[PDB]
């Protein structure tokens, strides 16, 4: 609430030299921007040195402080320090509070210095994406025709592998390919839950594709629309989008768009990948008729940014909802970028409401300014469940409405494996309840009854495993 009010009152100015901005850059040991030197007193709870006097700012190595955009974002995001602190005295046990701006800079409190190559970007984090848009049903279309062979093929394989990192476990994905014949790239044949394991199969299968044949956009799009109308399998029943990874062409395929989505319930995002001289006219037409966007990826450097910008399009209906779209969501357990253990993050998007009282702006107000965030460490939750009054064989455990354990004696602060390691914080620790302990038939109905939010007791005999993984007891 204090972020929308301050931003609306902000006056866009382009001169910064005569009136400098003051802030603390996280990754430091400049006219137009003054820097602060903090005291950095050591404090408990956190495992580092923090200052409670101001909030730190993290700017990606690619983004540049000084841009009218960045410098403008560094003034209206300065009244946040007053409410960042005001939250702290009321609840002294408050952990990281972060505002992930859409520009790329994250302002978090309390101030703490940033942790080789810093590839962190606040717009790619799982807590940012889950609050920036509703769950989706993306199906990726990959052009594996002859003309994409060479450099543009390795750009496509990286691009597909880079956007699959923008999906959480609530989204459903599948990757297809057309080369005058449309087929899947993996053993799936339909939309999958896009968890840590399923995405690994798609990434591995995408890396093994070969470019040869004749392009055919009609067969590629018929397969794309058919797979989005299954309804036999579990799905998100939400944003249905199609990503087309091609270079260029001359085919519009307007008959397919007129047959499968007349009312335009399917967004089509088109990516033109690589450096070439083919026509990009039809590629832009599909992105405008269908409720989509047109992106260009000419090199490896443009792969990263262009693969998360499709989320501001998906957030347009969320903005127009108003106060009904402001509900706090909690992500899966994951490892904090600033090392703090296993944490979960609340989230709340913030809207652009300049001219709301005048009621006629509707120009950039359809986009979100950023996503808020507050972290809750699993240690705080475990303090609410006393254990020593119980026997050493009893314990508490709670799970997501997906089967993933929020807290469990088996859940360890270590990333989960997905296969055999080979040599020639980014991913959540998603451990299912049936994998945390031994799997029984009675414990499956217990798991389902807990997903549905019911309340019941059950006593039975089961197979438990000793603390060391060598014995079995009943």
């Amino acid at each position: 609430l204090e972020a929308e009010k301050v931003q609306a009152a902000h006056q866009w100015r382009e001169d910064f030299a005569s009136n400098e901005v003051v802030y603390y850059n996280a990754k430091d040991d400049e006219p137009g921007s003054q820097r602060i030197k903090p005291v950095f007193i050591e404090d408990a709870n956190f495992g580092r040195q923090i200052s409670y006097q101001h909030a730190a700012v993290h700017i990606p190595t690619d983004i540049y402080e000084g841009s009218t955009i960045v410098l403008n974002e560094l003034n209206w995001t300065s009244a946040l320090d007053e409410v960042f602190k005001k939250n702290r005295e009321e609840d002294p046990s408050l952990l990281w509070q972060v505002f992930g701006s859409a520009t790329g800079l994250a302002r978090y409190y309390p101030a703490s210095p940033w942790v080789k190559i810093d590839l962190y970007d606040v717009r790619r984090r799982p807590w940012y994406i889950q609050g920036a848009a509703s769950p989706k049903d993306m199906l990726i279309l990959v052009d594996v025709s002859g003309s994409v062979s060479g450099l543009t093929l390795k750009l496509i394989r990286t691009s597909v592998s880079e956007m699959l990192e923008t999906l959480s476990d609530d989204d459903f994905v599948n990757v297809a390919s057309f080369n005058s014949n449309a087929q899947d790239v993996s053993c799936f044949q339909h939309l999958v839950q896009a968890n840590v394991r399923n995405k690994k199969v798609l990434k591995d299968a995408v890396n093994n594709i070969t470019a040869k044949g004749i392009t055919d956009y009609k067969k590629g799009f018929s397969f794309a629309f058919e797979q989005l109308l299954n309804y036999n399998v579990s799905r998100a029943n939400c944003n249905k989008i199609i990503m087309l990874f091609t270079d260029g062409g001359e085919e519009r395929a307007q008959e397919i768009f007129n047959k499968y989505n007349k009312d335009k319930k399917v967004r089509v995002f088109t990516f033109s990948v690589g450096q070439h001289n083919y026509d990009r006219g039809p590629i832009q037409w599909m992105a405008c008729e269908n409720k989509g966007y047109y992106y260009e990826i000419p090199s490896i450097g443009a792969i990263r940014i262009n693969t998360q910008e499709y989320l501001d399009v998906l957030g347009r209906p969320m903005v127009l909802a108003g106060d009904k779209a402001k509900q706090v969501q909690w992500t899966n357990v994951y490892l904090d970028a600033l090392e703090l253990g296993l944490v979960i993050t609340g989230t709340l998007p913030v809207f652009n409401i300049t001219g709301q009282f005048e009621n006629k702006t509707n120009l950039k107000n359809q986009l979100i300014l950023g996503v808020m965030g507050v972290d809750v460490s699993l240690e705080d939750i475990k303090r609410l469940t006393p254990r020593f009054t119980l026997c050493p064989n009893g314990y508490y455990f709670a799970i997501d409405p997906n089967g993933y354990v929020l807290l469990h004696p088996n859940l360890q602060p270590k990333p989960i494996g997905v296969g055999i390691p080979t040599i020639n914080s980014q991913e959540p620790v998603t451990l299912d309840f049936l994998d945390a302990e031994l799997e029984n038939d009675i414990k499956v109905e217990i798991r389902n009854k807990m997903i549905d939010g019911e309340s019941g007791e059950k006593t039975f005999r089961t197979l438990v495993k000793s603390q060391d993984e060598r014995y079995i007891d009943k």
């Binding site: 055999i420 390691p421 080979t422 040599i423 020639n424």
Partner: peptide
């Protein structure tokens, strides 16, 4: 686990 080889 100890890394494999490729």
């Amino acid at each position: 686990c100890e890394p494999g080889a490729a």
